[PDB]
């Protein structure tokens, strides 16, 4: 049996989890109340796959999720919403105030207490699983909860389980727009968490998804629902191999092996090709070559970083739907022929290929059109260093005068931790610089 445990910390994590579980329930034909009419309709087969949903004796399927957030409001919206009957009542809510965009509150003082109960529920779930594959945690840099409690949870999970894979999906601060003034402090303080304990961390920028929604989907006024739906599609594309049969199945272990050349460079970018509206779905073939070329466009990247300013270290293409290996090989050859896409000399192969027969599903009331084919490209490249350097600059401009520091140090945190985190992030940058220089 193959399965993963999904964790959602913070408001962004909980909302992304709502989108993800909506998509999963629609994919597997599970009703919001947990009953699957397909069981009585068919009388056989396997529809409620054990990757995400656990079956009970009464025919009710319950997801393998642990929603956590110090704010009662965000999870209370779920507990009284449409999916109130889906999740287990144990929803891990701290009946107190929030981290207040403070890493120290979410890591030292208030982030504790609930941590033991959260680890207890995670332990219960892990005992429930057989052949557990890994953890998929959803958080967001810049938030107090998503920084501090994520640090605590990742640390304790590393101590307890250790060997299991740990995938992170996070919203990195944007170059320009943000909804808090202390985002650089939390983001730079989360570097130890995202570098020591996480085995593979994916980062998405809100401005990139806004531009994608505006240009491709022709949505002039997007909101967080569309961003969460796109992230849900990305995670579904990642995890579709563990569920549905395919010609080339990509397990999480082999997925991680071919995307992390070295231990401390596990920060790949993500992109989704067939992002197109219903009106523009016509007039375009959407063949394999078109989507494969569309993956590498700088315009379609999910993070504000130009790939042409660095080098492509490794790449993994996961196809879904009516895709044949011949077209994938032809597209990869065409991409290798192109010269604007530069690959490091020490990786002659470069590309990993996976194919799945199940095509993508369309959420009701959504924006993505129905497409026979789809692909997700997950690429480890050195351009991400630039995306880290901009934020680094902001931190210095806020740390020269010790602005907003008294709030952090009044919750048990030491002043020098800022400088230590800065030197750490400085290191990761130098390493992404060193790994580029070609050999001689």
């Amino acid at each position: 049996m193959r399965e993963c445990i999904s964790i959602h910390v913070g408001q962004a994590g909980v909302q992304i989890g709502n989108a993800c579980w909506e998509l999963y329930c629609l994919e597997h034909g599970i009703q919001p109340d947990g009953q699957m009419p397909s069981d009585k309709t068919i009388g056989g087969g396997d529809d409620s796959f054990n990757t995400f949903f656990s079956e009970t004796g009464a025919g009710k399927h319950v997801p393998r999720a642990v929603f956590v957030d110090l704010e009662p409001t965000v999870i209370d919206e779920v507990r009284t919403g449409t999916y109130r009957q889906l999740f287990h009542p144990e929803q891990l809510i701290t009946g107190k105030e929030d981290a207040a965009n403070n890493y120290a509150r979410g890591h030292y003082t208030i982030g504790k207490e609930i941590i033991d109960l959260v680890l207890d529920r995670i332990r219960k779930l892990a005992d429930q699983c057989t052949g557990l594959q890994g953890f998929l945690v959803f958080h967001s840099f810049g938030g107090g909860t998503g920084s501090g409690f994520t640090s605590l949870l990742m640390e304790r999970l590393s101590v307890d389980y250790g060997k299991k894979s740990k995938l992170e999906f996070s919203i990195y601060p944007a170059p320009q727009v943000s909804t808090a003034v202390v985002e650089p402090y939390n983001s730079i303080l989360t570097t130890h968490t995202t570098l020591e304990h996480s085995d593979c961390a994916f980062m998405v920028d809100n401005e990139a998804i806004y531009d994608i929604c505006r240009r491709n989907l022709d949505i002039e006024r997007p909101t967080y629902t569309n961003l969460n739906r796109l992230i849900s599609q990305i995670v579904s594309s990642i995890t579709a191999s563990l569920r549905f049969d395919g010609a080339l199945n990509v397990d999480l272990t082999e997925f991680q092996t071919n995307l992390v050349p070295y231990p401390r460079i596990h920060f790949p970018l993500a992109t989704y090709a067939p992002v197109i509206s219903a009106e523009k779905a016509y007039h375009e073939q959407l063949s394999v070559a078109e989507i494969t070329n569309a993956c590498f466009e700088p315009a379609n990247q999910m993070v504000k970083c130009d790939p042409r300013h660095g080098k492509y270290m490794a790449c993994c293409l996961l196809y879904r739907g009516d895709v044949v290996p011949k077209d994938v090989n032809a597209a990869i050859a065409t991409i290798k022929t192109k010269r604007s896409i530069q690959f490091v000399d020490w990786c002659p192969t470069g590309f990993k290929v996976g194919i799945n027969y199940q095509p993508p599903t369309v959420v009701p009331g959504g924006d993505l059109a129905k497409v026979q084919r789809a692909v997700c490209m997950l690429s480890n490249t050195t351009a991400i260093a630039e995306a880290w350097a901009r934020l680094d600059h902001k931190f210095d401009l806020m740390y020269a005068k010790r602005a907003f520091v008294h709030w952090y140090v009044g919750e048990g945190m030491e002043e020098g931790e800022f400088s230590e985190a800065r030197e750490d992030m400085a290191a990761l940058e130098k390493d992404y610089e060193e790994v580029g220089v070609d050999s001689v």
Partner: protein
């Protein structure tokens, strides 16, 4: 759960609190008798933030009413919502301070402070998880200023962890109603900057200007001013009571708005303001809300923000809207007005959004500014203070109640340290 204990001191504080409770009861659908007659289910989702549930399905506000003159208390009781309050919370005495801060803080208030603190302790201990206190009063007055400062100091000693807020009405350049306003204002500002976490500065001149120019009211009264202050009060705490795409607590606002401990004085504002008979011409949208937000004439503190720099601002929007639009609008406001924001705090604009607008508006929003220009107010008060302390204009009335020139001198020195602190980040050019 996060619930707030409300305290009202002085005549102005009592009036503003009465209007504020009227606004809150209308928002939550609470009848004047205390029963619930709302329509939406979200009204009772977080009613315990501001109310306590009684036996007969009634709701009593968690208010504490304080004064040294029974007249204001009788005025509140003989009113539309007089019966809503708990009678035991009407703490009052006789022989008010009479516009004398020394009487309010040392002589008369020192006796009623024990009863007020007893009621505060009883109310706070019944909470599940207290969040903080909010106090409404006027600094230029008598019993209000003195007993408010005394209560703030005592509660801060009692409950150091919880957040403290204050909605302070301060003197004005032109609109003067008492002769000893500078003395009370100086001592109140000393106590406030010592022992508070947030302090929203309100001015009668700015509210009158908003009424005359924006709302086109021919005959504004204190009711309209209390209405505006109540709208701001509800906007500040909207996020605790209703769900939103991006929540924001009072603690989060305090963390994001206070760069250094002594800079916790704020300029409030509210949008939209339409004047009636012009709503049909105006198109309501997020750009219009933002444009009215950052206009100089919409501020309630009687400060021109263009005479300084914005240390940090926070916008809380209410109503269904797109996050891309609001983020873009804040970015354009920052970029176009590049010279009015400090260059060492990139993106000094906090954003919060809630999905439950006011009852009669499709969209609304509130603004909290922290800018250097506020220094002007303090400077003005200091000038007037000097103009009376050089000759000891009215000093003896204070010194008869157990005061000394040293206390006034240190209060003035602390205000000068405050204005110097604010002035430090006004001039441009500095650093890498």
């Amino acid at each position: 759960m996060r619930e707030i204990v409300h305290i009202q001191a002085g005549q102005c504080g009592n009036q503003i609190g009465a209007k504020f409770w009227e606004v809150i009861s209308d928002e939550h659908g609470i009848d004047p008798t205390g029963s619930y007659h709302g329509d939406s289910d979200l009204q009772l989702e977080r009613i315990n933030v501001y109310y306590n549930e009684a036996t007969g399905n009634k709701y009593v506000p968690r208010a504490i009413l304080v004064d040294l003159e029974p007249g204001t208390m009788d005025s509140v009781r003989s009113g539309p919502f007089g019966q809503i309050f708990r009678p035991d919370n009407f703490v009052f005495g006789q022989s008010g301070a009479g516009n004398n801060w020394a009487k309010g803080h040392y002589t008369e208030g020192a006796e009623l402070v024990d009863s007020v603190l007893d009621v505060v302790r009883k109310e706070s201990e019944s909470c599940d998880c207290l969040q903080g206190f909010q106090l409404t009063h006027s600094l230029g007055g008598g019993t209000g200023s003195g007993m408010g400062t005394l209560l703030i100091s005592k509660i801060r000693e009692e409950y150091p962890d919880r957040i403290m807020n204050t909605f302070s009405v301060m003197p004005s350049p032109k609109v003067s109603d008492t002769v000893v306003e500078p003395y009370n204002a100086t001592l109140s500002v000393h106590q406030l900057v010592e022992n508070t976490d947030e302090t929203y500065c309100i001015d009668n001149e700015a509210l009158y200007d908003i009424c005359f120019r924006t709302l086109k009211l021919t005959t504004p009264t204190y009711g309209d001013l209390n209405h505006l202050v109540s709208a701001t009060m509800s906007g500040v705490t909207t996020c605790l009571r209703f769900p939103g795409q991006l929540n924001a607590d009072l603690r989060k606002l305090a963390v994001n708005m206070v760069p250094f401990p002594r800079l916790h004085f704020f300029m409030p504002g509210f949008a939209p303001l339409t004047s009636r008979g012009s709503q049909q011409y105006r198109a309501l949208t997020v750009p219009e809300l933002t444009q009215q937000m950052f206009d100089s004439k919409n501020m309630m503190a009687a400060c021109d923000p263009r005479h300084g720099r914005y240390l940090t601002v926070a916008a809380i929007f209410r109503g269904r809207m797109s996050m891309k639009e609001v983020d873009e609008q804040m970015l354009n406001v920052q970029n176009k007005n590049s010279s009015y924001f400090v260059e060492w705090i990139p993106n000094n604009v906090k954003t919060a959004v809630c999905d439950i607008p006011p009852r009669g508006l499709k969209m609304s929003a509130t603004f909290i500014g922290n800018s250097t220009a506020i220094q002007e107010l303090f400077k003005r008060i200091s000038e007037q203070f000097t103009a009376m302390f050089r000759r000891k204009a009215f000093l003896h009335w204070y010194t008869g109640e157990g005061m000394d020139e040293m206390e006034f001198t240190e209060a003035e020195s602390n205000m000068n340290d405050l204005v110097s602190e604010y002035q430090q980040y006004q001039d441009a050019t500095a650093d890498e």
